[PDB]
Amino acid sequence: HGSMDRPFIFINSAMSADGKLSTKERKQVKISGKLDFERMDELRAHADAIMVGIGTVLADDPSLTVKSPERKAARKAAGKSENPVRVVVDESARTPLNADIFKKGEGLRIIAVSNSAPEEKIRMLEEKALVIKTGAFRVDLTELAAKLKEMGINSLMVEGGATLNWGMLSAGLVDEVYTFVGNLIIGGKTAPTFTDGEGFTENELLGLELSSAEKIEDGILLKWKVKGKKN
Amino acid sequence: MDRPFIFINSAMSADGKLSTKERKQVKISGKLDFERMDELRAHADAIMVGIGTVLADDPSLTVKSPERKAARKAAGKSENPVRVVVDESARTPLNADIFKKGEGLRIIAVSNSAPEEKIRMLEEKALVIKTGAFRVDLTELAAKLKEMGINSLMVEGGATLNWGMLSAGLVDEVYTFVGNLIIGGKTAPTFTDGEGFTENELLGLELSSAEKIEDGILLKWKVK
């Protein structure tokens, strides 16, 4: 609520015991069971916005809607859209026009693109969404986060992918990290992990503090507070 | 045809990395996790590590505590459990710390393709077991270790070996100490690399326990 130039930002992901979001072929798998799904749906309902990378949209085509009719009703009754604002970090404006983000649910859609993105594709996405241009080739996530706060977003749920999570963590933007660790091994050197991208060197490691650990169904939910550069 | 009890033990970051994108070791475990690992090493008959770990970190794989060493010795064991390197092309360095430090049997498991001149050099310092064509045959290796008296085998990592052992169906349990940090990097080694399972071949686990230790948390998983 106070003296930031960005929303409160938290990452929520389900991952395998070896730290994967999906297989080497980037196919989505069952990690969460129902109770973790239920908790995720409650977090979505209390967030002002959900943010996802373009990679996740192309692979999984998620709607990013709140599922429970009652959570939707409650948000509406309190004067909010049924769904929080849905944000795609999409450098080259590749978000498909028939994506499920656009088919399902009421609410504001934002596509954050780079200044290099082809103008013809931006124009097409402007029919269905607000398009924010920032950064040259990589989307400037610090700038994007400023613009979201400025428009009223105070709670921003980052729903993955490996690249986005790296973007947000390496720019210093994340307050907290929630990992539901499921009861499986996925494997694979090229399988997306909870944090990919460039990676930190030994001197720029990001410190965390364990806030809680709670067994849920067949896995365990770990919650971490982000502290900043250890060095 | 038969095998030791096999368990993997590793420290990893919150995002599942063993080290950085440059394969440089970092502080994940604190002292109490170091202590627990040392106790596991002392009760194991053997420790196994991939060649990748030997080249990157050059670990000794010794038991550190003088008292755990003494207790093993008192019970008629070598001070250190048997040290095994899975090393398909016989690249284990001759001045590796596995060979400089401590008493005990060293085994280099190599493939039948490995250059004979290098095998002969390693045979001066260790028992060399040949199996498989290009990849080491881990099922066969595990049979030969059981046969020579090893009933408890600690797998101490490398993203590649861990994949080898898990994808061949050889692992009974998995111990992951999850440290309070983010390492990041698409090319940073994870707790399981290699080929990877497809959506239809995912390896199921059962959570056995979860215990906070210092600033992280130790997860233990039963395989399958």
B173-178 β-sheet, strand order: A184-185, B203-213, B216-223, B173-178, B5-12, B152-155, B46-50, B82-86, B106-110, B127-130
Q: Is B155 on the interface with A (CB under 8 A)?
A: no
| B 180-209 residues inside an 8 A Cβ radius of A | 180-188, 190-199, 202-207
Cα separation, A71 vs A159, in Å, equals 19
Angle at the Cα of B210 from the Cα atoms of B204 and B214, rounded to 5 degrees: 135
Which member of A17, A181, A201 has the closest CB to residue B20?
A: A201
CA angle B9, B13, B17 (to 5 degrees): 80
How many other CB atoms sit within 10 Å of the CB of residue A26? 17
Q: Is B46 helix (H, G, I), strand (E, B) or coil?
A: strand
Query: Which of B186, B191, B203 minimises the CB distance to A196?
Result: B186
B195 vs A24: CB contact, 8 Å cut-off? yes
Resolution in A: 2.5
Question: Token pair for residue A39?
Answer: 């908790």
List CB contacts of B147: < 8 A, sequence separation 6 or more.
none
What is the DSSP secondary structure assignment for residue A230, as one 8-state letter? -
Q: Can you give A60-109 as a three-state secondary structure string?
A: HCCCCCCCCHHHHHHHHHCCCCCCCEEEEECCCCCCCCCCHHHHCCCCCE
Query: How many alpha carbons fall within 13 Å on the CB side of residue B40?
Result: 20
> What count of other Cβ atoms lies within 10 Å of the Cβ of residue B149?
10
Q: Are strands A206-216 and A219-229 parallel, antiparallel or unpaired?
A: antiparallel
Q: In what order do the strands lie in the sheet with A49-53?
A: A130-133, A109-113, A85-89, A49-53, A155-158, A8-15, A176-181, A219-229, A206-216, B181-182
Q: How far apart are CA A26 and CA B198, in angstroms?
A: 9
Query: Which one of A17, A169, A191 has the shortest CB-CB distance to B182?
Result: A169
**Helix or strand or coil: residue A129?**
coil
Experimental method: X-ray
Instruction: Count the Cβ atoms, other than its own, within 10 Å of residue A123.
Output: 11
Which pairing describes strands B203-213 and A184-185: parallel, antiparallel, or unpaired? antiparallel
CB-based contact B44:B154 (threshold 8 Å): yes
Q: H/E element holding B181?
A: strand B181-182
Determine if residue A228 is left, alpha or beta; phi over 0 gives left, psi from -120 to 50 gives alpha, anything else beta.
left
Tell me the shortest Cα–Cα distance from A188 to chain B, in angstroms: 3
8 Å CB contact between A29 and B199: yes
**φ/ψ (deg, to 5) at A179:** -120, 115
What value does the CA radius of gyration of chain B take, rounded to a whole number of Å?
17
The amino acid that residue B126 corresponds to is A
**Please, what's the b/e burial string for A129-145 (b: 16 or more CB within 10 A of its CB; e: otherwise)?**
bebbbbbeeebbbebbb
Q: What distance in Å separates the CA atoms of residue B200 and residue B222, rounded to the nearest whole number?
A: 20
Distance between CA atoms of B146 and B138, rounded to whole angstroms? 12
Restricting to A residues 2-41, those with a Cβ less than 8 Å away from any Cβ of B are: 15, 17-20, 23-25, 27, 29
A190: containing domain: 1-231
φ/ψ of residue B42, rounded to 5: -65, -35
Classify B76 in phi/psi space as left (phi over 0), alpha (psi -120 to 50) or beta: left
User: Measured between CB atoms, does B166 come within 8 Å of chain A?
Assistant: yes
Question: In the numeric block, which tokens belong to residue A42?
Answer: 């409650």
Q: Which residues pair with B205 in a beta bridge?
A: B223
At B164 the three-state DSSP class reads: helix
Q: Say whether A195 and B185 touch across the interface (CB within 8 A).
A: yes
Q: How many domains does chain B have?
A: 1
What residues are paired with B17 via a beta bridge? B190
CB A125 within 8 A of CB A93: yes
- Among candidates B190, B212, B219 on the partner chain, residue whose Cβ is nearest the Cβ of A210: B212
Q: Which two tokens stand for residue B34?
A: 């170091």
Element (H, E) at A110: strand A109-113
Scan for tokens 């008629």, then name that residue: B76
Distances (CA, A) of A21 to A149, B59, B200: 28, 31, 15
Which of A10, A164, A185, A196 should one mutate to test binding to chain B, selecting the residue with the greatest count of B CBs within 10 A? A185
Q: Which residues of B touch A166 (CB under 8 A)?
A: 184-185
* A128 Rama class: left (phi>0) / alpha (psi -120 to 50) / beta: alpha
The three-state DSSP-derived secondary structure of B79-125 is CCCEEEEECCCCCCCCCCHHHHCCCCCEEEEECCCCCHHHHHHHHCC
The residues near A201 (Cβ < 8 Å, ≥ 6 apart) are B20, B21, B22, B24
Q: Helices A69-77 and A34-46, interaxial angle, to 10°?
A: 10
Backbone angles phi, psi at A107, to 5 degrees: 140, 165
Q: Are B65 and B91 in contact (CB under 8 A)?
A: no
The reply to whether residue A208 touches residue B183, judged by beta carbons under 8 angstroms, is no
Name A8's bridge partners: A155
Q: Would you give the end-to-end CA distance of chain A in angstroms? A: 29
Amino acid at B144: K
A 10 A CB-CB count for A208 gives: 26
Query: CA–CA separation, A228 vs A87, rounded Å?
Result: 25
Q: What CATH number did the domain enclosing B206 receive?
A: 3.40.430.10
Those residues whose C-beta lies under 8 Å from the C-beta of residue A69, and which sit 6 or more positions away, are none
Q: How far apart are CA B148 and CA B145, in angstroms?
A: 5
**Separation between Cα atoms, residue B207 and residue A180, nearest integer Å:** 13
